[PDB]
Point group: C3
Amino acid sequence: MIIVYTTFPDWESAEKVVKTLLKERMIACANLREHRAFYWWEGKIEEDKEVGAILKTREDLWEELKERIKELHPYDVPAIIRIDVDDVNEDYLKWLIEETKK
Amino acid sequence: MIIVYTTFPDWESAEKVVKTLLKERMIACANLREHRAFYWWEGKIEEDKEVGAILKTREDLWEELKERIKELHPYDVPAIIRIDVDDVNEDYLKWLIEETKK
Amino acid sequence: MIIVYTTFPDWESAEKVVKTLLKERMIACANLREHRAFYWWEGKIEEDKEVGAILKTREDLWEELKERIKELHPYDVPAIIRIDVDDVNEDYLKWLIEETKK
């Protein structure tokens, strides 16, 4: 399995994008939590409030999922970061395989 | 070293499981923080509040630690995700080797 | 690209260290968020409040960045953890390459 981390403008879209993704079964689970973003943006170091999301799904889905977020994200260019999981416990991953579209 | 991410029902058990783990010296450090879980559960997309935990220990401990959490987790099937650390600074990891059971 | 996770005593230094890093262009973006630390410290299992940071930059920068944090961190021995990103979307990483010193 893998972890996909992306950030959102506000809770609205995060929940919207995330529930859409679960419905479509692109991911099994999501963990959202706010955080303060400090980043280089066009003419200045900006600081705003964001809603980061931790999506968890199948490695084979990485491609189509990345595609799907591009299409759903409020941001013209989302951060879609994939971090592979080197190991996971025996039940969970069976629960995740079942929960994601085939 | 590696990172082990697991989620809890509430702060009660998170602290209970986490302090138990440190005592037993299964991990050197833990970082807990709440997050909103959106996941596929039996008959519906549920949404609740959770307490995610970031455990940090030795790679050789991964096996026994996974075992230990299964035995301690409130959840009948915990998410026990291992993410290997590709590199870490020189002091910290010595501090972590010392802090974990031999 | 890679992820560098480090923790801070309070928001003061986190923002100070993080903005310094962006200015110097050592990293493109940072996401800070508080968390409760439970860790083995000298004579006891301590529990305090921390400000964890997720720094995102180039893998080639890992070395100099680790060096730089050691020099900037309030902590005599920071946790500087590097987690490589196995994949990232096509725009973002171009935006990150541009945002980091050459």
